[PDB]
Ligand binder design. Structure first.
Ligand SMILES: NC(=O)c1ccc[n+]([C@@H]2O[C@H](COP(=O)([O-])OP(=O)(O)OC[C@H]3O[C@@H](n4cnc5c(N)ncnc54)[C@H](O)[C@@H]3O)[C@@H](O)[C@H]2O)c1
Ligand SMILES: NC(=O)c1ccc[n+]([C@@H]2O[C@H](COP(=O)([O-])OP(=O)(O)OC[C@H]3O[C@@H](n4cnc5c(N)ncnc54)[C@H](O)[C@@H]3O)[C@@H](O)[C@H]2O)c1
Ligand SMILES: NC(=O)c1ccc[n+]([C@@H]2O[C@H](COP(=O)([O-])OP(=O)(O)OC[C@H]3O[C@@H](n4cnc5c(N)ncnc54)[C@H](O)[C@@H]3O)[C@@H](O)[C@H]2O)c1
Ligand SMILES: NC(=O)c1ccc[n+]([C@@H]2O[C@H](COP(=O)([O-])OP(=O)(O)OC[C@H]3O[C@@H](n4cnc5c(N)ncnc54)[C@H](O)[C@@H]3O)[C@@H](O)[C@H]2O)c1
Ligand SMILES: O=C[C@H](O)COP(=O)(O)O
Ligand SMILES: O=C[C@H](O)COP(=O)(O)O
Ligand SMILES: O=C[C@H](O)COP(=O)(O)O
Ligand SMILES: O=C[C@H](O)COP(=O)(O)O
Lengths: 334, 334, 334, 334
């Protein structure tokens, strides 16, 4: 129903497209990148991580054709020249990784779009949303440049909400053992982050992440209570959050796990999942939820310090949340 | 000086041999495994992780020949038939991973050996030692079967000692992002640990670890105060400990790092190192210390909760410790 | 229809099971290995390479329960103690890798089975078969221990057959860049093959193979005309055959590709596939054919020397051929 | 002795610098890239592939300092603004990968350099040289823009030269199982080569190469007789050439290997090496020769077709040849 445009047809852009194919309320009519339709069509059809696309993909001129529908292909590195308005695109998914600042993301609006969903932490955005945690704060009148946060924040926020509401978080620190991404390097190349400059598939690479602090954007009561880091490892996809927190109320491992499972089957169903099986990262590839508690790893000391481990497919889960958010925003009127 | 025997010439067995080559007080005269001299010689010379052995290696009958010296090669599945006594072996490094129970390791003594160093956490051992933390507790009269702990415990114990002495640890939890080992599997094979049964180079694999609790064996004051887990990832060597602890005293990042650096230069030099460089795991391959603080990763919340990250070459660092313990024990008289 | 038993429920054993679920004429009633049902059930449900099994899987005593059907689980190290006859098993898939010699494989016959399919090159087998090339040579009265050859031979033979019939092969050499298998080692460990003793995920590992020679077993006119080698690389599954051959007739890339495409759509449909897409190994994961020509890689030099490259999912393709062979053998009467 | 400048301080650029440190007649006075001195210093000190640099490395202002000597650091995207003349640089190693066309590489000359060594196959170069094969063809008065070919051609040419001179090559095909390089992609991303656009550490990736045809540039008699391809695999460094050729003479494996060893000990010592050890790629990391025969892999079929396999550290071997070439060129007069 709602016309959607994707800017930056990369890992998130393409997987967002795959997810959109499963939602009748969202119609992707155009994509933009820095290559030709032949290239984007080939990358969309064949995926090194998610397999062959379950749909008919071809090229007509320099446009894509998916299951009978033609998708307009653009190649403008300056978002201001996208002319979204001319093709009736109301919502733009900004997933290039280069326009997270409002001054750049807003160019889509200058170009005729109505709403912009930045697929990452942003700067000067109207509001940062994590589905299942604060989409209720979205205001169609005052919100036009929206951030869907990072995949890590979408993993953490959902269960941090449960823990705080049920037991109260005094403070905590997290570490995300994360798969490498396209922001890393193949073989020691110059990079702003001297850690990310190192061969991505050869080492455990400690790096930064504002995911823990970003939680306060969707859960203001946790402001200043969480901190964290990341460790990029030699896997192509799927990551895991490791939170150690000091709780206000005294608890047992069983109480913590019950609260999480209750939320997973209730209020956060589809967003937060709960697993009691001894699985590994590959088993979560293709998972659409934002966070899956690894219940076997939950532990507690003195009934006050707890460790919660949660899995997340940083590509598929997040992409699904982008599409969910677009439908949500659309349902509130454009 | 002292004559050493190595049972299980594997990853730790061979790397202990490399370490011993640089120590004059230690003399390896025999090694045991389940193959021939040709194979062990080949494996000793060419290492996929630590490169070509910087020494002359050849074979002569059932003996290895390194830099002129000859090392006897045995192939007894049952350590009871090793006849250590006959060849004057005083200290036996038990590194097969099959004889961690005291009743089994003791077979070496029955075979004529003086002491036995189990290269791993043990069961019913006379005592567990972590060099630089509690070797002063070793008693030559009563300690015959000693455990040198796990590489992970050797990385954690040292800096946990400093944090407790200077600030006092109330409670804490750790996670070690650890390289895969030979106890894991190439492609989904039966394993007592259903996580470790999965393809090791394809996933982030959570698995239990008794390292956090094992710290109590070398630091009784921390009994019941720590706990943790492990996450095996697609790297061949080098691991890292991530500790989040609640302290008794209030601190700042600067204070924590300052105290860690001081210990690295003083009491724990050669055991604990300190780094202000933004390095990755490959950079630590070949490191001889047991623990190296990644100072740039240190963080604190409310001045009470701290995170400390420390690197360790689970093969090289641990192997050196094994030799240090061998020399130490020997210095107390056999 | 025909009752089948699987000895060695590993990579091939379990994937053969998956293929069997898709063939109504094959009923797997029991499997044997060296572990418990819980472990086998877990490995069958979650696969690091092919994903979650799309079937209901549970355990009942010593039986697996797949889609309501009961599958007996044995744990007999000695094939002679399997008692296949007692449970009406007529065909046994020998996939442990330990019994490729006829004298050993025949132990299944001693235990009551009627036919034994060795899932690999064998010694003194009654006959070696490659579906699509020589199943017509199977003799129900004289062939009881049959080899289904290697995955590599199943990949090469089909297109070698086309090249020979259409252009005539004088002689040729092949190299198969192959994914690592459980016959290799995680980290430098003892192995009869000193190349395979080295860390599998860290190097390109040359290793011998009789796959090219084995072609003569299914295509006698190529006896003494082919030979080759293998190179194991750090990929979990999917391999590719690289054949360079001297032809009797002058040819061009187009003529070679056209003849290959013609056979893939005709006589070898389902066994041999043809692709003009610029794909990579991950794209072939799950492919059920024995051989897929990478048409873009076809080359010819000086008119008479050709290079043909073909892909094969060494697990899925082969496993499907095993089941195909079991159905064919059965159709001939037991 | 000769002042050298490096344009593109990447994998080849930095490894050439390492080789230079060991050659008294070569002096790198300046390097140019697209970042700062601190970033380049960090990358020079810590190498994910070749370990830490064994030398003192620091920064002083906008320059590097190695073992007391200062190295000027430039950050000019346009080689024409390098002012090589103003600092006495006579030979420029062009290793950015963007200026392989003579018109572009010639800009270094316009900037005051006397000779330009393109570290790769080139277009319209005055001449292409492979040390040990045709440096004698270098004419100091007519050759200013010189190509040192690719690492693959430097591996192939030396033994192709031996096989042709001894037995005569009618025609042949090669495949190089090559480690991934910085020209590939971490995860699926747009690329002019749709194969190279795929996750580099996840697949076996077929791709083109002109190495086989390029041999004609250094060995004219082989013009039109050789062709080949490449297969990029999940390893960070070290590659291997696999050549299959039809010979004019009937030969034996022992005859081929003996001829190769003879050239390795004489005519091509230091360029071509010979090994009878069953090694793997990791074992060749750091190797400085251009090509090492894997004697155990040599194979002959039907007397006239041979397969020769040779290893090469595509980073170290080639980098040493670049330095050897600069020295040679210098000895002919600037
Ligand atoms: N990959 C993950 O795990 C993950 C998860 C959640 C969010 N994100 C975020 O989403 C964004 C994209 O990440 P990704 O992993 O998909 O990156 P990517 O590198 O795979 O994709 C980026 C795409 O944008 C294109 N591009 C670059 N500049 C452009 C421009 N000026 N105009 C148009 N197209 C341009 C590139 O060609 C590429 O196809 C980032 O902000 C990132 O932090 C990543
Ligand atoms: N690898 C590490 O990171 C690490 C670190 C610290 C301690 N350890 C511990 O050291 C021990 C060995 O580990 P590893 O990684 O070296 O394993 P490994 O598998 O590489 O080496 C074990 C060796 O013992 C041999 N062996 C097995 N049974 C034997 C027997 N009955 N008699 C003689 N030889 C036999 C094997 O052939 C093999 O060479 C384990 O207890 C382990 O937990 C490992
Ligand atoms: N993996 C491939 O790509 C491939 C392809 C074609 C053929 N094959 C062949 O198939 C065979 C098996 O290979 P795989 O890769 O499945 O190996 P694997 O190691 O995954 O499976 C072997 C299984 O047999 C079990 N086993 C071993 N000894 C046993 C015994 N005595 N009794 C009962 N069970 C026992 C093991 O526990 C394991 O589950 C080999 O002959 C191999 O050459 C492998
Ligand atoms: N890596 C190998 O195995 C190998 C072997 C032999 C030859 N080569 C060749 O050497 C060249 C470089 O390859 P590499 O692997 O070192 O690449 P790389 O990507 O590691 O290094 C290229 C360097 O050039 C810099 N750069 C890019 N444009 C620049 C410009 N305009 N001005 C100044 N600096 C710039 C980059 O920042 C980078 O540091 C290529 O032509 C390649 O084909 C590579
Ligand atoms: O999941 C974590 C973030 O989404 C990673 O973003 P990146 O593209 O900067 O690596
Ligand atoms: O460093 C951690 C332990 O020493 C690992 O032991 P493992 O051999 O069981 O993997
Ligand atoms: O496909 C190749 C062979 O079937 C591999 O056999 P393996 O189990 O010895 O690796
Ligand atoms: O060794 C082969 C070539 O030198 C590789 O060049 P590349 O930088 O394009 O990967």
């Amino acid at each position: 129903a709602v016309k959607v445009g994707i800017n930056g047809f990369g890992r998130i852009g393409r997987n967002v497209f795959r997810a959109a194919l499963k939602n009748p309320d969202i119609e992707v009519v155009a994509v933009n990148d820095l290559t030709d339709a032949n290239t984007l069509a080939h990358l969309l059809k064949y995926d090194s991580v998610h397999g062959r696309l379950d749909a008919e993909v071809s090229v007509n001129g320099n446009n894509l054709v998916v299951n009978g529908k033609e998708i307009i292909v653009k190649a403008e590195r300056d978002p201001e020249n996208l002319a979204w308005g001319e093709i009736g695109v109301d919502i733009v998914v900004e997933s290039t990784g280069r326009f997270t600042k409002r001054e750049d993301a807003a160019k889509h609006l200058e170009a005729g779009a109505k709403k912009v969903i930045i697929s990452a932490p942003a700067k000067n955005e109207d509001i940062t949303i994590v589905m299942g945690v604060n989409q209720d704060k979205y205001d169609p009148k005052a919100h036009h440049v929206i951030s869907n946060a990072s995949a890590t924040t979408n993993c953490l926020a959902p269960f941090a909400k449960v823990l705080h509401e049920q037991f109260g978080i005094v403070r905590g620190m997290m570490t995300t053992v994360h798969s490498y991404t396209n922001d890393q390097r193949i073989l020691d190349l110059p990079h702003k982050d001297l850690r990310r400059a190192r061969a991505a598939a050869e080492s455990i690479i400690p790096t930064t992440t504002g995911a823990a602090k970003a939680v306060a954007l969707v859960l203001p009561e946790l402001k200043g209570k969480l901190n964290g880091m990341a460790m990029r490892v030699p896997t192509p996809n799927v990551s895991v959050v490791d939170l150690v927190a000091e709780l206000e109320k005294e608890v047992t491992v069983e109480e913590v796990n019950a609260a999480l499972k209750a939320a997973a089957e209730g209020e956060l169903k589809g967003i937060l999942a709960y697993s009691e099986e001894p699985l590994v990262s590959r088993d979560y590839n293709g998972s659409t939820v934002s966070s899956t508690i690894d219940a076997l790893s939950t532990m507690v000391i003195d009934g006050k310090m707890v460790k919660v481990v949660s899995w997340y497919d940083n590509e598929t889960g997040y992409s699904h949340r982008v599409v969910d958010l677009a439908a949500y925003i659309a349902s509130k009127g454009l």
